[PDB]
């Protein structure tokens, strides 16, 4: 086959960023070269023709260009949405169809801290001698907020792990998932037990508690 | 527009073994034309051709004899089947809608693969509720409890609020250990109390188990 890349694998953009990536090859594909796009829970999307054939039922917002070893594609318009992945793919009779590594376009309005909520945890972790703690992280951005786990308000070396989530425009930010596990003789000796979050965005040290008897 | 119906659900030991359903809706199949596509979360994208438009078929080189297709013009219905599925052919399908055939328009439902060695397995019902505030608070958010199970699918229902497609629920996320976890929280009226007994549960799906049973306030004063 071929090898296919993309310039840059990820980008951070705007409401209105005239976007600007390329994808390049080592060998022209003459016409049939497809760039697409992917929107997570949802359908891809076929984005151009040729190298700027536009069609039914996209806005006009886009321009793709390139040629010889190099593509590109810039976008006049970015509506807030437009954060998404996007592949590039060329076409041939040649059954097998290769997929070029991902451009993980971002849209970016600040550096935010993360927010605070929690829920009980279920009885499943009481009964089998694994303490955990539950604290829900939610609304921040960018990623990188680092989480750590100090217990009494106690720095240790790890007891965290992360699995965030996705853009969600109802909020314009990112979320994550974690877990933690500890031994049961760790829940004694502490008495209060919250999380803590390392965020480019912070201008003070954090540190939450809350009530058990709330709600 | 053109509309399509898609189907099926496989879990199976390695090597398995399925036929599926694809009807498109709207329009005879004799003119358009239409392929599978493989969804995979974290593995990624993949997908299918046909014949006559595009000719023969696509499949991967060892899936070439593990997977086969037919058609069925008059019924206008598509149907896959496979006989050997592969250790890592673990996957949800779509079908594509084509127009100019090599770039897919509109989707289906779905097809899920499932080759684990975990076996069937259920959980049980925790419902959540908030503090004693509810008796004149006019809404507020509920919760559910349910981890550790076999396949994602995991149905919460209440008869209070909004209809049932308003439960905050949808299919959990599979590790290593092959286990599922996931929560449900609702936010239904306060004021049906009074008026409708509350019922919760769990309607899990590979869960071989039918106990129903109602809901009663905490009731603290007791």
């Known amino acids: 086959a071929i090898q296919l890349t993309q310039s840059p694998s990820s980008l951070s953009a705007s409401v209105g960023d005239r976007v600007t990536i390329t994808c390049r090859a080592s060998q022209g594909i003459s016409t049939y070269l497809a760039w697409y796009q992917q929107k997570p829970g949802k359908a891809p999307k076929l984005l151009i023709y040729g190298a700027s054939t536009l069609q039914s039922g996209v806005p006009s917002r886009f321009s793709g260009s390139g040629s010889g070893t190099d593509f590109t594609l810039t976008i006049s318009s970015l509506q807030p949405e437009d954060f998404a992945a996007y592949y590039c793919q060329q076409v041939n009779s040649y059954p097998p169809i290769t997929f070029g590594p991902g451009t993980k376009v971002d849209i970016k309005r600040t550096v935010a801290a993360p927010s605070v909520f929690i829920f009980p945890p279920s009885d499943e972790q009481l009964k089998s001698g694994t303490a955990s703690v539950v604290c829900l992280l939610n609304n921040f951005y960018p990623r990188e907020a680092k989480v750590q786990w100090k217990v009494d308000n106690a720095l240790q070396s790890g007891n965290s792990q992360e699995s965030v989530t996705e853009q969600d425009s109802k909020d314009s930010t990112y979320s994550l998932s974690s877990t933690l596990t500890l031994s049961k003789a760790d829940y004694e000796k502490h008495k209060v037990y919250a999380c803590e979050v390392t965020h480019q965005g912070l201008s003070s040290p954090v540190t939450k508690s809350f009530n058990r008897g709330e709600c | 527009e053109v509309q399509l119906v898609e189907s099926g659900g496989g879990l199976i030991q390695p090597g398995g073994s399925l036929r599926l359903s694809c009807a498109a809706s709207?329009?005879?199949?004799?003119?358009?034309?239409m392929s599978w596509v493989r969804q995979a979360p974290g593995k990624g994208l993949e997908w299918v051709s046909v014949?006559?438009?595009?000719?023969?078929?696509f499949y991967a080189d060892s899936v070439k004899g593990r997977f086969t297709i037919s058609r069925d013009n008059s019924k206008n219905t598509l149907y896959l089947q496979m006989s050997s599925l592969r250790v890592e052919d673990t996957a949800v399908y779509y079908c594509?809608?084509?127009?100019?055939?090599?770039?897919?328009?509109?989707w289906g439902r779905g097809t899920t693969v499932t080759v684990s060695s975990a076996s069937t397995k259920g959980p049980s019902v925790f419902p959540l509720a908030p503090s004693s505030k509810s008796t004149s608070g006019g809404t507020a958010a509920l919760g559910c409890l349910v981890k550790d199970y076999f396949p994602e699918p995991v149905t919460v229902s209440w008869n209070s609020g909004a209809l049932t497609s308003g439960v905050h629920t949808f299919p959990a996320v599979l590790q290593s250990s092959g286990l599922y976890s996931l929560s449900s929280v609702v936010t239904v009226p306060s004021s049906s109390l009074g008026t409708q007994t509350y019922i919760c549960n769990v309607n899990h799906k590979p869960s071989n188990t039918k106990v129903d049973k109602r809901v009663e306030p905490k009731s603290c004063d007791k």
């Open positions: 594509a809608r084509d127009l100019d055939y090599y770039g897919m328009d509109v």
């Open positions: 709207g329009i005879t199949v004799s003119s358009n034309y």
């Open positions: 014949i006559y438009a595009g000719g023969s078929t």
